[PDB]
Amino acid sequence: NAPSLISILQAIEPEVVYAGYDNTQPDTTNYLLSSLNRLAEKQLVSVVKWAKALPGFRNLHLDDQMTLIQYSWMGLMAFAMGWRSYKHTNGQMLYFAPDLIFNEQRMQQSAMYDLCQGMQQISQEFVRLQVTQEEFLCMKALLLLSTVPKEGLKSQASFDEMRMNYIKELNRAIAKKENNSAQNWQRFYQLTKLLDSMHDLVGGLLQFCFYTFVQSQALSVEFPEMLVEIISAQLPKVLAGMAKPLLF
Numbered sequence: 581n582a583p584s585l586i587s588i589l590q591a592i593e594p595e596v597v598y599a600g601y602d603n604t605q606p607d608t609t610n611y612l613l614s615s616l617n618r619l620a621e622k623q624l625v626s627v628v629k630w631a632k633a634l635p636g637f638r639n640l641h642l643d644d645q646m647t648l649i650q651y652s653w654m655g656l657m658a659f660a661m662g663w664r665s666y667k668h669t670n671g672q673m674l675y676f677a678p679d680l681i682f683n684e685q686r687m688q689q690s691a692m693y694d695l696c697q698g699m700q701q702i703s704q705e706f707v708r709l710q711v712t713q714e715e716f717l718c719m720k721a722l723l724l725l726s727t728v729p730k731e732g733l734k735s736q737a738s739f740d741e742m743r744m745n746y747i748k749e750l751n752r753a754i755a756k757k758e759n760n761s762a763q764n765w766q767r768f769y770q771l772t773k774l775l776d777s778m779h780d781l782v783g784g785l786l787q788f789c790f791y792t793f794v795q796s797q798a799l800s801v802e803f804p805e806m807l808v809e810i811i812s813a814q815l816p817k818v819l820a821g822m823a824k825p826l827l828f
């Protein structure tokens with residue numbers, strides 16, 4: 581038989597981005613958030629590259645490709661970050677990158693404190709659930725495929741199939757470990773529930789994101805160029821209520 585989606589997914593998994601951050605410079609809500617954004621630009625590149633590698637994704641109309649990316653990019657980055665914070669700090673600290681890890685001081689200095697907390701609860705779940713790589717890779721894959729424009733998609737049928745497949749491979753991945761039916765079931769539930777709770781958080785995140793974006797010169801937070809492009813193109817569709825979370 582052919583190499584599984586997970587085999588491919590483990591292969592196309594992006595390397596960890598460094599922020600470029602200076603940790604000697606003091607913790608100032610403007611410096612922090614500017615720095616975060618630089619990173620989001622660094623990640624956005626790795627994410628899109630990632631999505632192009634992602635089996636079936638190239639087979640969607642370019643309209644859909646860019647839209648999905650436009651909607652899911654925030655959740656993708658927050659989730660991967662939930663994952664990293666789990667592996668590297670076991671949920672205690674927010675591990676944006678090896679050179680830019682938030683602790684308590686910096687979550688406070690962030691002026692997003694309640695959102696940090698939320699992202700943390702996400703990593704803490706990763707921890708509670710002892711999520712595995714393979715569950716993670718498939719979850720993240722589904723996370724992309726979990727916020728679609730309400731007016732439908734060019735490639736609709738092909739997408740629904742992809743979604744199907746990534747649920748199927750999330751199933752292959754929970755099934756490893758044995759347990760049989762019932763345990764599996766609760767698992768599937770918990771994971772997908774974790775996925776579904778993602779939208780919630782992304783909500784607050786986009787919200788504060790836009791907020792910070794509009795008021796950028798007001799707040800002295802430096803959004804880089806690719807970041808300008810993407811947030812901008814996302815913003816009006818999002819407000820319009822074009823984007824609709826797919827749930828379980």
Ligand SMILES: C[C@]12CC[C@H]3[C@@H](CCC4=CC(=O)CC[C@@]43C)[C@@H]1CC[C@@H]2C(=O)CO
Binds near residue numbers: 620
């Ligand atoms: C976009 C954002 C800065 C960048 C991060 C995001 C939260 C999660 C996140 C994960 C990453 O590992 C990279 C950057 C990023 C996407 C923040 C949510 C609010 C904050 C701002 O709105 C300030 O720009």
